[PDB]
Design a protein around this ligand. Sequence first.
Ligand SMILES: [Cl-]
Lengths: 125, 125
Amino acid sequence: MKLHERLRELRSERGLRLKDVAEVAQISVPYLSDLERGRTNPSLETLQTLAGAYNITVHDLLEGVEFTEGALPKGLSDLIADPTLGPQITPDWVRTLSRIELRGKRPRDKQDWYEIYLHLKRILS
Amino acid sequence: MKLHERLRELRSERGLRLKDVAEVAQISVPYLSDLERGRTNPSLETLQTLAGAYNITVHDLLEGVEFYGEGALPKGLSDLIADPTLGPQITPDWVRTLSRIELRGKRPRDKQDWYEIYLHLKRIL
Ligand SMILES: [Cl-]
């Protein structure tokens, strides 16, 4: 969702008036209201202020929300993300693998990437 | 952890060089480095750019980081409305109703405590 919708949801579902939030944060009602409208976008340090008064972390505040590209191919990133599998792979091995492309084509998903990683490791060792 | 370390972790664990991450994002190589060492913090517009460039979301990117700098509700009262299975069934104005229960500033601690009272009182009213 949008961030202004989320910031309004957190206070309304919690039964709080703008003033209640205003006072516990170091913030005013017009500015907070602008933020819950979404004219302004807040600093991270304003988001701390809001999180802390909602008794929520800033990670958790940003749960339902959304607001580019990608520097590795997505399957390669998924492999880096796998908990059991990923960590065993050198930072080097990621950029080495990442250069593998045939005119656009790339290994599709992480066990594709994992597969050739294993073959390639034997050869380059 | 801290947001500058996290931003340095993502690029380091993917064997990426600053210009990689600077080339898919609007930012400059110098600006990224100042983000990564902690000198200034990025906007939310900037955060999203980096996150997608690491193929994760902004929520996930802040999985780990934390910030420093008071609550408008009791913690357990918040913990309850944040509970996904137990929390949406409670209305904003049951939430207000609960918060006025304190004796000497002493309050129900955990959400089971807040829930226990909600069930009794909701039956009385
Ligand atoms: Cl080619």
